[PDB]
Design a protein around this ligand. Sequence first.
Ligand SMILES: [K+]
Ligand SMILES: [K+]
Ligand SMILES: [Zn+2]
Lengths: 288, 130, 96, 138, 101, 393, 165, 37
Amino acid sequence: KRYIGNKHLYTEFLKILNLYSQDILDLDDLVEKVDFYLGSNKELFTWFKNFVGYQEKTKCIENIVHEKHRLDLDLCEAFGPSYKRLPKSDTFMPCSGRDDMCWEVLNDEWVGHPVWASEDSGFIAHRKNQYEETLFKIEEERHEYDFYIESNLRTIQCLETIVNKIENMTENEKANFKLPPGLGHTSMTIYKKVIRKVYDKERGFEIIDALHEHPAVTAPVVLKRLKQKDEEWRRAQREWNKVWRELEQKVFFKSLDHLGLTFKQADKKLLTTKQLISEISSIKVDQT
Amino acid sequence: LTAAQQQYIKNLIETHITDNHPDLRPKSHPMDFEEYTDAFLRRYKDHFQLDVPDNLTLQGYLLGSKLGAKTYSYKRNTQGQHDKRIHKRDLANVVRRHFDEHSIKETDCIPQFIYKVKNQKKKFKMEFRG
Amino acid sequence: TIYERLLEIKQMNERVTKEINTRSTVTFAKDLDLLSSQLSEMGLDFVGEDAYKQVLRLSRRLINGDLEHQWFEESLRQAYNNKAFKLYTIDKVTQS
Amino acid sequence: PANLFPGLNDITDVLEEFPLATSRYLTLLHEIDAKCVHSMPNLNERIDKFLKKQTQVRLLNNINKIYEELMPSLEEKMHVSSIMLDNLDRLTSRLELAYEVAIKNTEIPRGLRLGVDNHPAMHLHHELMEKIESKSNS
Amino acid sequence: ETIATRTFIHQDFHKKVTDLRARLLNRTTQTWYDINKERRDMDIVIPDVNYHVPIKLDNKTLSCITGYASAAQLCYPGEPVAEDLACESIEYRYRANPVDK
Amino acid sequence: VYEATPFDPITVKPSDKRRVAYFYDADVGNYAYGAGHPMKPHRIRMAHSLIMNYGLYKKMEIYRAKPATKQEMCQFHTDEYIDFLSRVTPDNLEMFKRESVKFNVGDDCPVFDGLYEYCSISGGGSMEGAARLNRGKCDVAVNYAGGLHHAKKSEASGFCYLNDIVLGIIELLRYHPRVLYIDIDVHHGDGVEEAFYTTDRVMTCSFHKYGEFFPGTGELRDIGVGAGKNYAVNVPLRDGIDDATYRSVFEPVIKKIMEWYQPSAVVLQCGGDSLSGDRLGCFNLSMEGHANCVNYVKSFGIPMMVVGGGGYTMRNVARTWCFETGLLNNVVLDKDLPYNEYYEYYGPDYKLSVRPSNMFNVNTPEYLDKVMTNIFANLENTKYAPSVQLNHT
Amino acid sequence: KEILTPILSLGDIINHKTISRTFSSPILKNLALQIILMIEKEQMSVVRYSQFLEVFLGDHPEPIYESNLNLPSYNHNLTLPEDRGDPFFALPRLEQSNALLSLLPTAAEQQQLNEEIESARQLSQIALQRNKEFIRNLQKIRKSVIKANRIRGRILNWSREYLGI
Amino acid sequence: YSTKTAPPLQSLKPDEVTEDISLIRELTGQPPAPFRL
Ligand SMILES: [K+]
Ligand SMILES: [K+]
Ligand SMILES: [Zn+2]
């Protein structure tokens, strides 16, 4: 009562507290709404939060004591070939959503350590051809096109529903329309990355802003650009489809021949008299 | 590169590129009741026994178009019935008005708050209107 | 050395011929003209006469020096996907 | 002052009492079960049969017969479970106070619990973060 | 493709509705048994006693009578807890060293 | 304890039928690690297409599962890790240069737009599959967006950022005593094994390639510490292993585990970097050889939860996933692909086939005999005490 | 005089001969096993009751496929002819549970069948909610038991490291 | 030979983008943008 000062806003504050006590508000939205009255004072707020029984679901980064450590696992006690014991202080890392069997079943002190091993085989190291390496680039470019195009094709779907609805509404509903982040559907990330792909990686911000504040002015205008780039990009894609389809039909079958491709020289080199003698194993030459 | 667009772009990136602290998430005013989960609104209207219909969520409000006008939801919420839901702004304005006019004086607002907070974990306790 | 390779090929012969003889084509690929016929513009496909006799005849043509090595290799790949690389030098072993 | 180690002594008493309480109730539950071993099998059978089927009327009649034959023994179980739960919650509060007072005392030293300082490892961390902060200063 | 996703839309709706109803039934019958237990718990006239570690009380056991130590000053439900204690799973009371020596 | 045999025609047995619940979310394909990265979620979408166009959707039920929440992620991960994942974007990375260094972020696991949402989809699908399996609704539960088995409780490792399989098994353990996990990737399933190493309620079983490889762990002598000793099975193998070899190694290990451990909920990782032609793996498995594992794990008859994993040649993961999904419905598909929106990517003959190469098998009857004998020996200390009445698992 | 006395130090958890018989007992771990093993059987039951009630609530606990939603077929102008060179927005019309429609092929027999169908719904609901409360109790119990076992093990470990063992 | 590589997918030109941004700003009611066509 001393801090809030005025009696009118204090009255509204008390009415929100009563809104909680009357079993209408919830605890989290209660503290959220109290923020506007008890924000600038921290001790009042934390006494309140302890009073009401308010616990955060996870901890921030700016206030955590037992951090993660880049620790050199060379100086730690080993068990078996791979695992090493952690220091004790790195086992008090906060995992705020664990219940009792999430502590019974999970393992907290042993970490794995990778051992670089040299193999028993005396042989040549299997590798990749150049034919197997043309395919990977073909598929990288196929994927790049498919990614940009099929990501355009979902923002199209959303903006299309929104424009179909805007065309069936009055003028006061046009000046009284607003859309939440997510534009009314499940995802909240894809349409923004589309918008800064098509427009600008820096000025797509203003378009997304005016898309949230003025959906009736801003998003029949944006939908007519996504539909333009859809056709441009699909034109280019079905053009290059034949180039890739040509470059594939040769190296595909020459790409699963691991032995042959060098078996030519190998059979040249392992039919000499030296080796044909050495296979008899009772004759000795000397081991290389 | 003209001493205006420079700081224009600068303000844009300085306002849209941050470290997403939970301490900066934009919080709504307490008096704007449209930002209230639409279940708070229904519980308020149902507790003080106001006389409103329920609201259209957001999917039912974009469902209104010449193409959308053939779905079961439109034809169950727009014909002649009594359950005809409305736009969230209307219900929120009714709730806001019943909030600013019905009034309270303490001496019973505080002790009820304390009894409520100290019994949160209890299932069997005083229901302060029910 | 030569005999053993020919023996493995003549052991695979039966399954290989009745696999190349029951090959189907995927209709939409035929109608959109997506497949190729290079190894049929050259007769290098192993149509319904046996595959052993064909690889023999093609080995002979390769020895006489009219059939390039590239196309002998490619025909062997597509008819014997991973099973007849040990014939790619059937001309340089005989020569020795 | 001295240290008579009261936390660990009460902890020993608790941990010895924990398994004696439980087994009486477990035997009570086993006793309740022994009535429901010619009712639950054929009930499950008839329910799955009716679920995956002139006679169905008699089948549903049999199912209701067995249901309200077997109803009384299902309140025994949850009564026993409730008293078991209250007993074990008493024991758990006992345990937790003993534990917290052991830790709040030094019946477990705080260099043996939360480990050592500077731990011959962790020079990698100091190198890495030192370089980050250094070229942050650069 | 549009026929298939039509079927998918209707199947997902059916799933969510049946979950709704089973969950509301379970919640009401939960609240009923909790009401029952909290009702009978108000009927006890003499509670159970149990052992524990003697604590320092207001006008009681021994350290506050003879002028030796302070009291135990219980803490609030929900408060700054140390993270190590939050790992030893927890339930922490009695801000600082409750026991009476 | 290993005799090599020929590889028999994969064939569905009619005495058991399942109720497949398939989980898919039309958003997932829309995320991309970066320019040249080998990890492409788009392939999940591609598999969906074939499922639609083969007529396979008509015997199962296709659901979107709600994304997993921050506090469902922190059941296994730390708060600092998950808070980093939630706050980091390709634009503000410069203000997290410590955490990126500290959580193993930047080259093998970069930050893209939509990282947290992609992780939410994976975890949600896995946990909802597990929950629906607990409620007695479905028998098999498929989620190809999950299986990121290389992620650490506090670290990003190996294209993975969130271990959804750990959350799935945690939800499966609320109602089950003993859970089996099978991992037939070409890498070692090291996140799940590190997570459940000192317990006996999760038995992990990996079939991987041990060498100068990734991650570097999972020897034949790494079998569990504490009360979890003998509850971690590794099968290290060498290059070139093919269908007959793999089947003769894979079947008896799994069958002995089923007879001894008696688990009664199986999770199955079906990674696809273990196929011939993959760009990171080095096995020589066909599509029938890779699917006979699924068919065998299914022929037992206990709740299965199938998940995705690796596979870095999109065409081959798409085809083998669609074929496996057809097999879970007691359906052997047809080899000619139907026309779909990805009627490329399937050169040169447009069929339902994955073709092996002729590269050489570096695994011979004595190495395998030794490995399997050591395993059969390690795997007899893991039974249940004689007085412990079960529920016929 | 040695049996009967208190801990004098941390090392006494392994050195003492009576106190060591407690902190090394394999007993808090077998109880948790028996508990989960009974939870599993009771969940089998909960599952088999929870579908009877749904057959009698109207819901269809059977799996509904593309051929059960007898959706009305539509027609847009796709699927062109050879070489030439709304019922969309409608609702499934789900027929009936086969268990319920298998009952139907007088008035007295009909009221008999009505009372039977009423009794089934109410009995199954009671049994289901009771089994669910049973399971919730069992889970609280097992949580307490494994909490005790974990505390025991941490003390054992700190003790055996204090001695240098 | 081979070595044939698909060129990168392109976006709107700065002038088409400038026209849309000033038109959205005009229809709404904000002051003029700093870059005019
Ligand atoms: K593996
Ligand atoms: K384990
Ligand atoms: Zn892998």
